Symmetry: C2
Subunit: 166 residues, 2 copies
């Protein structure tokens, strides 16, 4: 039912918790790792701040700790068949320097894909990611990578909203 699925998600939640609490490097970054259940499934948020950035300035290049986080969780996410929506949220000051129209919009999507490639390098099955998302609004700095492990319902709703058919 929606039962075997919820059970899988709860187990995944526990496995991620076990992984984080058994790794010194992850324990040190815990405040920047948020896990919760949302309508569409299990959500994992990785906070990207000025004090502890997950990417190099104005770049989609991951920082050491971001690489450690993504590669560490990749194998665990692979445990279940649920697919994932990966979102890059970049509410920061106007992108400066190198830019042929390149703004926080391009930066947010690029970071989302940069995170996707790290998960894959870490062992995430290709195909697991169903979509990447970018969101950027014009001490209000808010940057983060969201990894949503979708329940069947949400996955289907996305596939229907994205098909050419009616």
């Amino acid at each position: 039912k929606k039962r075997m699925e919820q059970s899988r998600l709860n187990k995944l939640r526990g496995d991620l918790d076990q992984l984080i609490e058994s790794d010194p490097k992850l324990r040190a970054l815990r405040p920047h790792l948020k896990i919760d259940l949302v309508q569409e499934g299990l959500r994992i948020q990785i906070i990207d701040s000025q004090n502890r950035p997950m990417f190099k300035t104005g770049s989609a290049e991951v920082e050491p700790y971001m690489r450690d986080i993504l590669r560490a969780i990749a194998p665990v996410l692979n445990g279940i068949p649920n697919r994932i929506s990966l979102a890059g949220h970049t509410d920061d000051f106007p992108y400066a320097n190198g830019e042929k129209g390149y703004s926080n919009w391009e930066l947010s999507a690029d970071r989302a894909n940069a995170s996707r490639r790290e998960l894959v390098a870490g062992g995430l099955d290709n195909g697991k990611v169903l979509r990447v998302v970018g969101m950027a609004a014009t001490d209000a700095i808010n940057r983060r990578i969201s990894l949503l492990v979708l329940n069947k319902q949400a996955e289907q709703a996305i596939l229907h909203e994205n098909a050419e058919s009616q």
Copy 2:
């Protein structure tokens, strides 16, 4: 109610239809322009094929006709306050040449943003686009740009699924 909103969407649909049928260039591309009502709002699909590509090969650079389409509809979309989810769908053969991990995933998101910038150049109010999406699967070539004018419900569901809060 959901009434004033549906009426606005139906009016928008009619205005887009009027625009397309009054422009020679758009009439010529009509088969590649699909408009319909979906659960989340009004959807506009722009088909990107081998016979009539909307982007240069392996690039997020728009082709003339794509520029004409996007700049033409931009002012019309600006008529209502509803925001938009812009998606790039790229189901094509493995991306060749220039690539430091650059695949159809990066290409799909880049094309989505390239389309976003054209709408803005064409007069679309900044902020109107709520998110950009990229989707790329591993004569099955299927490429398209989807522009979803979101009804309040869908917009709120997106904002709740993307907030840090619970």
